[PDB]
Amino acid sequence: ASEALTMIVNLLRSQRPLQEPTVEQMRAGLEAMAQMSPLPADVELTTVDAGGVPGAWVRVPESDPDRVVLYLHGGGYVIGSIRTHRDLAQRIARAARCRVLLIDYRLAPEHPHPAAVEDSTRAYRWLLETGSDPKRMAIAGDSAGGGLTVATLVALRDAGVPLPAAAVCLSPWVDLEGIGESMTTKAAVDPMVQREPLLRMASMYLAGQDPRTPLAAPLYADLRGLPPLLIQVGTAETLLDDSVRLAERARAAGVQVTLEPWEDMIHVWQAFAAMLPEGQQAIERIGEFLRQHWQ
């Protein structure tokens, strides 16, 4: 891996937003870290009411105005915001030459499951209502937002809503019990995600519901009929086996899955693309994948 990976690992070993003592401090910690990646001058942000869900349009100069990624931010269903993820959103908008709708879906513990999935499906339905075409759309998300991407597709399919051309999952979180082998075997090399904080956030999202509830933990969902899926994951991740098991389940369901394991990469390494070469390389691959499925 690039020497820059050592700098990102060192940052994460000291700035541990998932290990902050309160939800308020976890939220503020991730906001402080995102504020470091300064936004390019050519990014246009437009706040919008996406059918009752607050959102922001992210546009860059080469955004095709009729192609849209609905972007579902990570943060364990508890943290993250339009602010934390607008840099990753603009990088994807640039690579995929599209507009990104970044939504502020309801967060736990204030709004437990299924609030997040109600909001992601409402935003997608609103895009259709306002004239977006499914063959020029995609849903993408990181970590909890990667799990929410799969759950959103399942819920839309079950409601008879036309599915988009493709979907992208970045280090998705789909096992809310943390029982993947890598949760043990990669614990020593993951500077961000460990079982204790994952179970803390799962508790807030589930509010006593079965941790294998399919739209909360899509490792247990019926995935038949989903569109082509790109799963990017790092091998230095306790969540590696979330991606491996999701790929197995989607392939068994007849889905066109690409599983891309990036050697030595850490959780949502794409968010560090300003400093990490593999982050920008992975975002270029996301853009290639989306443009191929919109052809």
Ligand X SMILES: COc1ccc2cc([C@@H](C)C(=O)O)ccc2c1
Nearer to ligand X, 31 or 64 (CB): 31
Q: Which is nearer to ligand X, 80 or 112 (CB)?
A: 80
Rounded to 10°, the helix 277-294/82-96 angle is: 60
Q: Least distance in Å: CB of 237 to ligand X? A: 11
Minimum CB–partner distance for residue 161 and ligand X (Å): 26
What end-to-end distance do the CA atoms of the chain give, in Å?
A: 33
Task: Report DSSP state, residue 17.
Answer: G
Shortest approach of ligand X to residue 18 CB, angstroms?
7
Smallest gap from residue 216 Cβ to ligand X (A) = 17
Q: Site residues (CB under 6 A) for ligand X?
A: 30, 33-34, 36-37, 74-75, 80, 84-85, 142-143, 268, 271-272
Report the 10 Å Cβ neighbour count for 285: 18
Query: Based on CB atoms, which residue is closest to ligand X, 265 or 271?
Result: 271
137-142: strand order across its sheet: 44-50, 53-59, 98-103, 64-72, 137-142, 166-170, 229-234, 257-262
Pick the closer one to ligand X by CB: 63 or 90.
90
Rg (CA), the chain: 17
Q: Which long-range contacts (CB under 8 A, 24 or more apart) does 8-13 make?
A: 8/266, 8/269, 8/272, 8/275, 8/276, 9/191, 9/266, 12/191, 12/192, 12/266, 13/191
List active site positions. 143, 237, 267
CB of 8 to ligand X, least distance (A): 9
Q: Which of 36, 18, 21, 129 is CA-nearest to residue 79?
A: 18
- In sequence order, what E strands does the chain have? 44-50, 53-59, 64-72, 98-103, 137-142, 166-170, 229-234, 257-262
Measured from the CB atom, is 36 or 187 closer to ligand X? Answer: 36
